[PDB]
């Protein structure tokens, strides 16, 4: 895939991602907060089309993600991120994608997700999260 | 179970845990580093006894945990931590316990586990980890 790295910001205003019922997460883009300003992150797009767009708009700064979870598993047959769910102190957005394969979760008791980095080809290959107080 | 919280330290020198191959993790106890000196954490002991002791002794400071993983699953009607695996930069420790149920993993790209908290009844119910740069 094409490696992407947003780096680290002040928090998260919005997540734009797309997915396919049959395969996996495709596109990923974040609108971060940067010292009180929306920071529009670069849209990291799949190499292919066919996905269902989803928009996760947060009530920043009162609403914030408390748990990222999902599934990784094989697709044509690359290990990719098939599924994502974002749970905040207000609600649960997802699951989006196919909920099959190896489940993962990151719940946070103290701290904030402040960045994403990863790689996308046909599908979201992997990702990591910056965490901060 | 009985709740516990070690707090934060400088790093990890040793993990002493116990388990049984039919059930789950039983006891958990950590020798932290505190500013270049060992600090013996409290021993968090199951309500029951009979588990197989394990000592993980790390070559601190050059050796450190890069990933923690295992399984959560039901034992006698309780959700508990059924297995743990500790992966350092030098080798893997585990699995200990029983690898059945729902997998979880925390890989770390940048930063250090510097404390544990959780609860233990007959088995380790849950735990969380303090992370620091």
């Amino acid at each position: 895939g094409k490696a992407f790295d947003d780096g680290a910001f002040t928090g998260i205003r919005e997540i734009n991602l797309s997915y396919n019922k049959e395969t996996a997460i495709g596109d990923f883009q974040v609108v971060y907060d940067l010292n009180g300003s929306p920071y529009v992150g670069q849209n990291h797009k799949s190499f292919i089309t066919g996905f269902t767009p989803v928009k996760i708009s947060l009530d920043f700064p009162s609403e914030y993600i408390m748990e990222v979870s999902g599934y990784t598993g094989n697709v044509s047959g690359y290990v990719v991120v098939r599924s994502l769910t974002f749970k905040t102190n207000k609600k649960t957005y997802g699951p989006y994608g196919v909920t099959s394969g190896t489940p993962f979760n990151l719940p946070i008791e103290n701290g904030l997700i402040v960045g994403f980095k990863g790689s996308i080809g046909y599908w979201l290959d992997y990702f990591s999260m910056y965490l901060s107080l | 179970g009985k709740a516990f919280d070690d707090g934060a330290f400088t790093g990890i020198r040793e993990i002493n845990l116990s388990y049984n191959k039919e059930t789950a993790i039983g006891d958990f106890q950590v020798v932290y580093d505190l500013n270049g000196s060992p600090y013996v954490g409290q021993n968090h002991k199951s309500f029951i006894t009979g588990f197989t002791p394990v000592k993980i002794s790390l070559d601190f400071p050059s050796e450190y945990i890069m990933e923690v993983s295992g399984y959560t699953g039901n034992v006698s009607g309780y959700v508990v931590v059924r297995s743990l695996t500790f992966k350092t930069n030098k080798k893997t420790y585990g699995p200990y316990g029983v690898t059945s149920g729902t997998p979880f993993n925390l890989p770390i790209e940048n930063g250090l586990i510097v404390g544990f908290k959780g609860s233990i009844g007959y088995w380790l119910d849950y735990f969380s980890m303090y992370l620091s740069l």
Partner: peptide
């Protein structure tokens, strides 16, 4: 020892 600030990063989940 450089001028780039650093943060805790957890991950990756997915491929290698």
């Amino acid at each position: 020892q450089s001028g780039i600030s650093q943060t805790v990063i957890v991950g990756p989940w997915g491929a290698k």
